[PDB]
Amino acid sequence: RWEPGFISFEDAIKRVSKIFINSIINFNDLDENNFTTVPLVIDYVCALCKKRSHKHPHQLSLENGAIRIYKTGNPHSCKVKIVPLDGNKLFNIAQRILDTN
Amino acid sequence: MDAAIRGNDVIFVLKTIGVPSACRQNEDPRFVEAFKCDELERYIDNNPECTLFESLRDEEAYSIVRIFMDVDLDACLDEIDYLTAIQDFIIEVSNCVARFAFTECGAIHENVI
Ligand SMILES: [Zn+2]
């Protein structure tokens, strides 16, 4: 008496990796049930702010079907990024078809 | 573009609400006053208790002003959500003002943005 209802988790992870110009160090460490907890370590090469380096790591939060990326410590230093996660299935199919060229 | 159109470094300020225009045009010392940036800086530093309401002397010659807005929400937001909201707000408002200028004032949209 993470929810994979829209797209796959690896797709979200690779989208996050693509958004970051610098490499992602702990990408493998992220799983279905740690992305809201595990802090992100970049390779500096931060795009969101064009600054050379950041004193504090970034973090991911899941909010109403979106992944929001914000830098810890003082959030005003680095811009907050928003990633849409909910997706029409008929659109993911089209994306997959265009991936094959 | 004249000198007053080039810039206006002298500022005019009131001291309360509801001052009649007769007193303003009579340069009443109890309500209106004229200052500069440095003068108002020491004024507000020395006399925090006063209430200061900056405005124009008159709309005939000093119509040029910086674009400004007042936002009042009866709530509180955490810092990260506040940042997201302010970014969306700034992009929407910048777009809207630029589009209005392009369609009416005939200015360049991208310059305004
Ligand atoms: Zn940054």
| CB < 8 Å & 24+ apart, contacts of A67-72 | A67/A12, A67/A16, A67/A35, A68/B80, A68/B84, A69/A16, A69/A19, A69/A40, A70/B80, A70/B83, A71/A46, A72/A39
Q: What is the resolution of this structure in A?
A: 3.3
DSSP string, chain B: --HHHH----EEEESSS---HHHHHTT-TTT-EEE-HHHHHHHHHH-TTS--EEE-S-TTT------------SS---HHHHHHHHHHHHHHHHHHHHHHIIIII---HHHH-
Q: Do A76 and B83 touch (CB under 8 A)?
A: yes
Contacting residues for A62 by C-beta, under 8 A, at least 6 apart: A2, A35, A36, A68, A85
The residues pairing with B55 across neighbouring beta strands, listed in sequence order, are B12
Cβ–Cβ < 8 Å for A37, A23: no
**Beta-carbon count within 10 A of A41 CB:** 15
Cβ–Cβ < 8 Å for A57, A43: no
Cβ–Cβ < 8 Å for A59, A39: yes
Closest CA to B54 of B72, B33, B39, B23: B33
Q: Do A82 and B84 touch (CB under 8 A)?
A: yes
Contacting residues for B90 by C-beta, under 8 A, at least 6 apart: none
Contacts of B84 in chain A (CB under 8 A): 68, 80, 82
d(CA A74, CA A101): 43
d(CA B47, CA B33): 15
Approach to solving = cryo-EM
DSSP string, B14-42: ESSS---HHHHHTT-TTT-EEE-HHHHHH
Cβ–Cβ < 8 Å for A24, A17: yes
**Structure tokens given for A35:** 């992305």
Distance of alpha carbon A48 from the chain centroid: 12
Strands (DSSP E) contained in A13-99 are 58-62, 66-71, 81-84
Residue of chain B whose Cα is closest to the Cα of A60? B80
The residues pairing with B35 across neighbouring beta strands, listed in sequence order, are B11
The residues pairing with A58 across neighbouring beta strands, listed in sequence order, are A40, A71
Residue A26 forms contact with B (CB below 8 Å) = no
d(CA A49, CA A15): 18
Residue of chain A whose Cα is closest to the Cα of B84? A80
CA of A39 to the centre of ligand 1 (A): 15
Q: 3-class SS at A85?
A: coil
Contacting residues for B28 by C-beta, under 8 A, at least 6 apart: B19
CA of A78 to the centre of ligand 1 (A): 4
d(CA A30, CA B78): 26
Closest CA to A35 of A80, A69, A71, A5: A69
